[PDB]
């Protein structure tokens, strides 16, 4: 079965599946966990940076796309770089040509479309990375979940990566609570770190291991790493 229909992305299986796409999705699950959630005034990204050795660094998992937008990745880092770069250009184009900040919902549509092309044509491969996009535009705070299949969804919060299901159930529970954390970033972040710790197991989030990013009303997307996240451990 499967073996005969998963040699490339241009082949449907007898049940209507696209294995190459599915295998790509598997790269995300293998990726380190990262969480995203928002109130009505801010959006936060909390990501667990994974290290190779104890002599190695903890790979960055958050990229800023513009002053009002940014994302977190889980999976093939290179693909995240390619996709965020594309997002940076799209944000840029909107500003230069229309003097308009790109709508988070529009960015999601663009990413979906860019990924889709890599699932219907011979020779290419699907992107092997998941992305959580947060931003503050003319309609407030926003959080988006991007999957290599090209499916992009807007949520109040979520998580992707290994053991992500932990943080996800927690947020699906804490919903009514954090969604009202307006005017108070520190609280939103703390709630973000509480959702992420729900996916720990191996170790515990340290200083050079935790990565946080926030954006909102009067806060340009900024990234906090190391000492800057100490007050949250």
């Amino acid at each position: 079965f499967r073996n005969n229909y998963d040699g490339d992305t241009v082949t449907f299986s007898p049940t209507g599946r696209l294995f190459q796409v599915e295998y790509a999705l598997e790269a995300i699950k293998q990726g380190s966990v990262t969480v995203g959630l928002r109130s009505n005034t801010h959006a936060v990204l909390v990501a667990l940076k994974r290290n190779a050795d104890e002599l190695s660094s903890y790979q960055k998992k958050i990229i800023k796309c513009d002053e009002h937008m940014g994302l977190s990745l889980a999976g093939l880092a290179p693909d995240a770089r390619v996709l965020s770069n594309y997002l940076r250009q799209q944000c840029n184009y909107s500003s230069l040509v229309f003097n308009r900040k790109l709508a988070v919902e529009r960015a999601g549509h663009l990413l979906c479309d860019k990924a889709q092309k890599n699932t219907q044509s011979y020779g290419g491969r699907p992107y092997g990375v998941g992305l959580l996009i947060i931003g503050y535009d003319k309609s407030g705070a926003h959080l988006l979940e991007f999957q290599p299949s090209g499916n992009v969804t807007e949520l109040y919060g979520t998580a992707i990566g290994a053991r992500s299901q932990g943080a996800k159930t927690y947020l699906e529970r804490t919903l009514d609570t954090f969604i009202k954390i307006d005017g108070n970033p520190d609280e939103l972040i703390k709630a973000g770190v509480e959702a992420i710790s729900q996916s720990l197991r191996d170790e515990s989030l340290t200083v050079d291991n935790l990565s946080i990013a926030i954006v909102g009303k009067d806060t340009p997307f900024t990234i906090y790493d190391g000492e800057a996240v100490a007050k949250y451990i």
């Binding site: 490339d8 241009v10 011979y122 020779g123």
Partner: protein, 244 residues
């Protein structure tokens, strides 16, 4: 995708051999034999016509001996249609050279170029190689009379006498047996006919199954002359040499 149907005509075998070249040579080994013999006063080209009929028009036929230049000719062993493609481009390279330098193209330059074209189909492009082997007979003022050979791989070498096509192993041994450096065109003509006569897979060796050519420097002139024997001319030389 398309990859599924790609034969990959340009890859190495685990032994470091090129599949298609090897198979093309196999194809050539079933082609009518062609022989080249170089003498002190000229070169002889003789080939056996593969398959013939009573109704085949031999006077208008030519399937093995082609004029490339007024000083160079080739004997063909393999796919005739493939051969004509190469012969045409070779005829063009010769003229490009002539127009550029105002001198007839040295024999090796032309042979190397044609062999390079062949080598290309061997390393890139994904196309099958040409199922052809050539024996080049020519003359230039740097090396005088020359005899060369090129095959599907794009490799070429020079010879005093050589053969391509069917039964070259046998044909080569016979040539190596009776060839002599001080030979004369007429001696070579005879040696060629005898050799084909012994390797033929057919009953007898008649004129209607042969093509013959000579590149000589007619003493009474001073220039080089190519002679592509006519049916009757072959029939004659065939009786004279004692084959009737």
């Amino acid at each position: 995708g398309s990859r599924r149907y790609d034969s990959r005509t340009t890859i190495f075998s685990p032994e470091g051999r090129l599949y298609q070249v090897e198979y093309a040579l196999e194809s050539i080994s079933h082609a009518g034999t062609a022989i080249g013999i170089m003498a002190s006063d000229g070169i002889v080209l003789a080939a056996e016509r593969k398959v013939t009929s009573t109704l085949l028009e031999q006077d208008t036929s030519t399937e093995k001996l082609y004029k490339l230049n007024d000083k160079i000719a080739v004997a063909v062993a393999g796919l005739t249609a493939d051969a004509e493609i190469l012969i045409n481009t070779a005829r063009i390279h010769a003229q490009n050279y002539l127009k550029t330098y105002n001198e007839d193209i040295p024999v090796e330059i032309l042979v190397r170029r044609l062999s390079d074209i062949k080598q290309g189909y061997t390393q890139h492009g994904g196309l099958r190689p040409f199922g052809v082997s050539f024996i080049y007979a020519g003359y230039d003022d740097r090396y005088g009379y020359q005899l060369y050979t090129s095959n599907p791989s794009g490799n070429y070498t020079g010879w005093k006498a050589i053969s391509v096509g069917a039964n070259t192993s046998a044909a080569q041994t016979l040539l190596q047996m009776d060839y002599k450096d001080d030979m004369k065109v007429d001696d070579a003509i005879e040696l060629a006919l005898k050799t084909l006569s012994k390797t033929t897979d057919s009953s007898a060796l008649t004129y209607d199954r042969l093509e013959f050519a000579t590149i000589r420097k007619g003493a009474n002139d001073g220039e080089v002359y190519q002679k592509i024997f006519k049916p009757q001319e072959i029939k004659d030389i065939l009786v004279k040499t004692g084959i009737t």
